Every structure is written in C-alpha cells, then in structure tokens.
C-alpha cells in the first residue's frame, strides 16, 4: 500500500519543544544520527559472527552522507541491521521510552538540548534542523518500509515499491529548514564528523562527490 500512527503523548510534547523553541546547539543532530547508525552496524556485525550469511544482502559495513544542495536535503545511509516494520512503529514514535519524560523535565530545569542523546530520544534531534524526515529501511526479516513524519502529531509507515532498494539498513533523509542550510556544505560536514565521531569504527564517506574522512 500505508498505515498511520499517532505519536505517543510524551513524544508529541518533545517534538514540539524541539521544533518550536530556538536552541543554540542544533549541530549535534548529525552526531546523534551518525551514532544511532553506528549502533545499528554493531548489531548486524555481532549477528554475523555466528552466521556469515547475515550480511549476504549487502556485505559492506558503511555510513554514507549525501548532501543534495538542489532538493535541500542532508541524507544519511547505513548498511546497519535495519528495522522491521514492527521496529519502525515501536521505536520511532509509538512507545515512549522513560527518558522522554525525564528529558523534558531536565530541559525545563535548564539542561541543554544536546543531552537529547543521553536520554534515549536521540532520533528526534533531527527535527532541530529538519522540517520533514523520511526514514526508509530494510531489515533481513522483513521487506523495505518507509517511515515519514513532519512532527504534526502522527507518522506513516508504508511498504516500499517505487523506491531504490537498499540491501540492508536505513536511509534517513532530512528536508532541511531554511536557516539550517549550512549542513549541506562539504567543509561543515567534514568538521562535524571529525568533531564528534572520534570513537566510531566504520568508514564514513561524503558523497558530495567521492570520498571518506576522519
């Protein structure tokens, strides 16, 4: 087909705080995404120590960052373990982990939005800089699906047909807000990566033409 779910209470509130307050440290979104994406690679790797055939669908473990100046989208893709549809509905909005409420309390008590990661809701940091996010994922156990939301209190999961099929993993596309146009520049991205990913152990490449960095 597509199915529609409404964000759990807590998460709606958080999504509001994120997309409606002006925060300073918006740049950590790329950290949180690159991370959540490392964590995903780790999983498919461990699953593969005892089953070499796990990565058959797509054998290289990687992270690609693809800034399209034209459509004004920063997009991140990994060959991580990916999400089943069930996983999409459960992690990206339907279940509200404990840190969600905890985080907002902390926020108002004057914590910094950069802690959004340490509280277990890192994913939504994307809406700091994006107005629409479109996650498309394929997990070994299920087919490719697409999660999409504009933070308007609900999200959609849809089976992927028209799309170009990933072997395995996840392709987050961030349709960037106006002011946030800076995360499309090659220099900026290269900075941000170096600055926060000095513990993450897979090839991160920048397809604003070609190559990989540090």
């Amino acid at each position: 087909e597509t199915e529609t779910f409404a964000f759990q209470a807590e998460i709606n509130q958080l999504l509001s705080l994120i997309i409606n307050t002006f925060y300073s440290n918006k740049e950590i979104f790329l950290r949180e995404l690159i991370s959540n994406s490392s964590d995903a690679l780790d999983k498919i790797r461990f699953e593969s120590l005892t089953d070499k055939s796990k990565l058959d669908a797509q054998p290289e473990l990687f992270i690609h960052i693809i800034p399209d100046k034209a459509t004004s989208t920063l997009t991140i893709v990994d060959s991580g373990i990916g999400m089943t549809k069930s996983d999409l509905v459960n992690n990206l909005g339907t279940i509200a982990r404990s840190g969600t409420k905890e985080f907002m309390e902390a926020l108002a008590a004057g914590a910094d939005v950069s802690m959004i990661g340490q509280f277990g809701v890192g994913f939504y940091s994307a809406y700091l800089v994006a107005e629409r996010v479109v996650v498309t994922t394929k997990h070994n156990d299920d087919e490719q699906y697409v999660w999409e939301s504009q933070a308007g209190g609900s999200f959609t999961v849809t089976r992927d047909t028209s799309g170009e099929q990933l072997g395995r993993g996840t392709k987050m596309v961030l349709y960037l807000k106006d002011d946030q146009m800076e995360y499309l520049e090659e220099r900026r991205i290269k900075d941000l990566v170096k600055r926060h990913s000095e513990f993450i152990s897979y090839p991160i490449s920048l397809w604003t033409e070609k190559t990989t960095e540090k």
């Binding site: 089943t84 549809k85 069930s86 509905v89 339907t94 156990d141 299920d142 087919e143």
Partner: protein, 90 residues
C-alpha cells in the same frame, strides 16, 4: 522456531510472525476472547505454535490476519481501549 514481535495502536494490537514464504494454506489461526492461536505448519517437523493467553481481551470477529511472504501480520482488535504492557499475560 520463528520469531515474533508486536506493536500496538490504541485500538488494535498487531502481532507479527516472521515466517518466509509460508503457504496461505499452512497457517491456521483462531481467536478467543482472551487467547490467540497461531499454528503454521512446518513440512519437515512439528508445527510452529504461538498460543499465548493474551494480556487484554479482544473482539474475535473483528480480528483479521494476512499471510505475506516475509511475515504473517495479525491485527487483534482490543476489546477495551487500554494499553497492553506485553503480548502475553503472566
């Protein structure tokens, strides 16, 4: 066996059984006020059983399921609009 998961909306609970290429014919699923029974038939050995006593109660006539090639989706219709804390009930 075969892996299972579930997610929930305020009105339904959706149990997925990850079973590749199961013939529509081999899946036998029945519903009860507070039970679910999934029995997909495996040709070689014993059947797969997923036969929990459900957390909440459900409306068995409103329950549907769908065999899909990667998975079998089962939409359980919650009898009461109340969030379940697990598929099963211990």
């Amino acid at each position: 066996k075969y892996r299972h998961e579930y997610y929930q909306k305020p009105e339904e609970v959706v149990v997925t059984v990850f079973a590749k290429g199961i013939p529509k014919q081999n899946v036998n699923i029945d519903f009860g006020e507070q039970i679910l029974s999934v029995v997909i038939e495996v040709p070689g050995e014993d059947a797969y059983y997923l036969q929990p006593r459900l957390f909440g109660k459900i409306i068995p006539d409103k329950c549907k399921y769908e065999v899909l090639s990667t998975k079998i989706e089962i939409c359980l219709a919650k009898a009461d609009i109340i969030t379940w804390a697990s598929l099963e009930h211990g």
